[PDB]
């Protein structure tokens, strides 16, 4: 099916403290492959995944020194948005990024994305056409003016439509036999009574890759749902509850790794 | 395999 | 990075000029053509960031990301074009310039 | 809009020599550059800001360039040898794309 390679970036500043925390971690669709955490001792891009161990050490460079160099980026960003947004030097504030491409099952380029946050709230993201800008406010709209008269939008495209889609089928291929695997959910029903006149049902999707998954009430919807957590081990769990004593008269799985989508009755 | 080019805000 | 462009290029006033160059990293975004007359600085005269053709008034410039290419045409050249011309070219955010090609404009 | 000073330098194998650097106003990144008749400019080192993220594997230790408030910029040459020889310049970029400045010709003499 669809595939996806996205990059999260967290820098935080810390002014009594020392420098600002950043974590930049990257996934291959729902499986990490590689982070950088600024206060971890190496100082190196990290593998995080089998797969991506066989890279030689002209990658493993190259991640490091443009890791580091959004690191700084990033750094200079934090001062960026303090001087924009009037804010002392004694506060803490966090900018987030996110980037990547999302190919289809031909493995050909589908959407791109590159957006920031600041303080939680929205910033600065590239528009679906990868040719413009939404800036959140008038602050975000002086990055936009600079990000437009720089030719950003054209640079970054390049990256999302060519360099990015080309890396992702590399990883794909490299980690064919993890990430190119569909892992059924392993359901089952559970029973417990709440009352002497009332009773609670639980539907279970266990050991399922990749993260997307419908669990419904046969359709009923008004019921506890739970967001899908990971096992972790590179798996992830999910389940739905409802709440008499005619507790027979159903739940729906519906999972990527499914022919027909499964049917569960007590 | 990270963006080689990085912009300011 | 290596970038590599080429040897002195003589060409008729009026005639098209047509330099060449290639860079090594694929990951590259950032594609410009300087020029730079004697005793003087590299000036910007393009850039180029999507593969395609790229037309400014007597320049074309051309680029490969696949083949990792990127070519300047000149179109009715004139005296004002002699100089040497450099392909310059992104390493993370920096530009990496080629050796430079001298392009001759005979009268 | 980036300038340079001294435009011209003859040093005495040996000496030391300062060239200065003043770039474009809102740009936070900056470079120097080594050239030599009949070839292109050789990256020398990159300034974000007073941070000298990059510097030439090339490049020797009687080299050192500063920028303190991440306004303008010294290249220094320590104890001259005759293969310093070559204008440096320096750019200015808001993003990637360069403005260079005038140059600093320098001839190191026996």
């Known amino acids: 099916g669809s595939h996806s390679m996205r990059y999260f970036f967290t820098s935080v500043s810390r002014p009594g403290r020392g420098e600002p925390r950043f974590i930049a971690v990257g996934y291959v669709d729902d499986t990490q492959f590689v982070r950088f955490d600024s206060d971890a001792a190496s100082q190196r891009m990290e593998p995080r995944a089998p797969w991506i161990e066989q890279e030689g050490p002209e990658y493993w460079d190259g991640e490091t020194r443009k890791v580091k160099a959004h690191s700084q980026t990033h750094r200079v960003d934090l001062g960026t948005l303090r001087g924009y947004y009037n804010q002392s030097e004694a506060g803490s504030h966090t900018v987030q990024r996110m980037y990547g491409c999302d190919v289809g099952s031909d493995w050909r380029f589908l959407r791109g994305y590159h957006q920031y946050a600041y303080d939680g709230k929205d910033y600065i993201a590239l528009k679906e056409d990868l040719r413009s800008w939404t800036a959140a406010d008038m602050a975000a709209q002086t990055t936009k003016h600079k990000w437009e008269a720089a030719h950003v939008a054209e640079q970054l495209r390049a990256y999302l439509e060519g360099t990015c889609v080309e890396w992702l089928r590399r990883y794909l291929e490299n980690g064919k036999e993890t990430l190119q695997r569909t892992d059924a959910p392993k359901t089952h029903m559970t029973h417990h009574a709440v009352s002497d006149h009332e009773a609670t049902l639980r539907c279970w999707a266990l050991s399922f890759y990749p993260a997307e998954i419908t669990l419904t009430w046969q359709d009923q919807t008004q019921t506890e749902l739970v967001e899908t957590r990971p096992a972790g081990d590179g798996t992830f769990q999910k389940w739905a509850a409802v709440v008499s004593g005619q507790e027979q008269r159903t739940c729906h799985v519906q999972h990527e790794g499914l022919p027909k989508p499964l049917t569960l009755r007590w | 395999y990270l963006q080689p080019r990085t912009f300011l805000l | 990075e290596v970038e590599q462009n080429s040897g002195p290029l003589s060409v008729p006033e009026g005639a098209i000029a047509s330099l060449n160059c290639t860079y090594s990293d694929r990951g590259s975004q950032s594609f410009f053509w300087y020029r730079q007359y004697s005793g003087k600085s590299p000036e910007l005269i393009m850039f180029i960031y999507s593969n395609g053709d790229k037309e400014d008034g007597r320049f074309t410039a051309q680029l490969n990301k696949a083949s990792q290419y990127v070519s300047l045409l000149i179109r009715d050249s004139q005296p004002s074009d002699s100089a040497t011309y450099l392909c310059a070219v992104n390493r993370d955010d920096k530009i990496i310039f080629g050796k430079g090609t001298r392009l001759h404009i005979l009268p | 809009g980036v300038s340079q000073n001294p435009r011209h330098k003859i040093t005495k194998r040996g000496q030391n020599v300062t060239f200065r650097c003043d770039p474009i106003?809102?740009?936070?990144?900056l470079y120097w550059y080594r050239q030599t008749l009949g070839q292109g400019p050789e990256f020398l080192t990159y300034f974000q800001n007073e941070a000298q993220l990059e510097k030439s594997r090339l490049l020797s230790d009687r080299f050192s360039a500063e920028r303190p408030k991440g306004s303008f910029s010294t290249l220094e040459i320590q104890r001259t040898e005759q293969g310093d020889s070559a204008m440096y310049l320096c750019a200015s970029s808001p993003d990637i794309e360069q403005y260079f400045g005038p140059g600093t010709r320098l001839t190191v003499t026996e």
């Open positions: 106003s809102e740009h936070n990144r």
